Amino acid sequence: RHSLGCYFKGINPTKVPSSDPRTVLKCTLPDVKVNASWTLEWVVVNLHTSVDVTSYYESSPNSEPRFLRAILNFTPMHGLRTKNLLKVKDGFQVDNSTDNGNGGNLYVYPNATTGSADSVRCRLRMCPWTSNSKMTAPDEEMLRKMSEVLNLPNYG
């Protein structure tokens, strides 16, 4: 797709009350109605790493941001990585269901260190699209509509 340049933001996730033994960490995604996609990466500060999986959202001029898909982090798309990524068995299961409605959220197991659980943070990549290959950046309208993300703290 015709990328207009991606933005990298940091979001503090919140804990969602649930009867489930596992803790639900949700990453806030602003209601932006533009032709753009968002990629989430769950990062653990205390471990200095991230969970081996990316979560994708998609919106449009008419449609609201919704969970698109989730893909395991085989290879980085922005340079090199090759870091000790966290596995499901480590107590880190990202919801990859489109039926649950909570896709993208991270399930933290009691087997996982709770100190590191509290150090979990959401890395947001916003990649707006177009159809004009001559464009290398979004216009005023898009920037205003994406301002809910653009005015977030930077983290990349």
DSSP 72-113: --SS-SSS------B-GGGTEEE---SSSS-TTPEEEPTTS-
Residue in 24, 31, 35 with CA at minimum distance from that of residue 103: 24
Q: What are phi and psi of 149, to 5 degrees?
A: -95, -40
What is the spatial distance between Cα 97 and Cα 95, in angstroms, rounded to a whole number?
A: 6
Dist. CA 108–CA 7, nearest whole Å: 27
Residue with tokens 């996982």: 112
Q: How far apart are CA 39 and CA 17, in angstroms?
A: 24
Closest Cα to residue 28, out of 154, 152, 155, 156? 152
How far is Cα 124 from Cα 33, in angstroms, rounded to an integer?
A: 17
Q: Tokens 């880190």 correspond to what residue? A: 92
Cα–Cα distance measured from residue 73 to residue 30, given in angstroms and rounded to the nearest whole number: 24
DSSP state of 7: E
Going by DSSP bridges, is the β-strand pair 54-58/66-71 parallel, antiparallel, or unpaired? antiparallel
Q: Give residue 38's identity as a one-letter amino acid code.
A: W
The answer to whether 24 and 105 have CB atoms below 8 angstroms apart is yes
Domains detected in the chain: 1-156 (2.60.40.2900)
Q: Which two tokens stand for residue 88?
A: 């499901």
Nearest alpha carbon to residue 104 among 92, 96, 112, 113: 96
Nearest to 33 by CA among 8, 11, 10, 66: 66
The two three-digit tokens of residue 65, written as one number: 């941001």
Which of the 8 DSSP states describes residue 112? S
Closest CA to 6 of 146, 131, 148: 146
CA distances from 57 to 60, 70, 125 (A): 11, 9, 10
Strand, helix or coil for residue 49: strand
The alpha-carbon radius of gyration of the chain (Å, integer) is 16
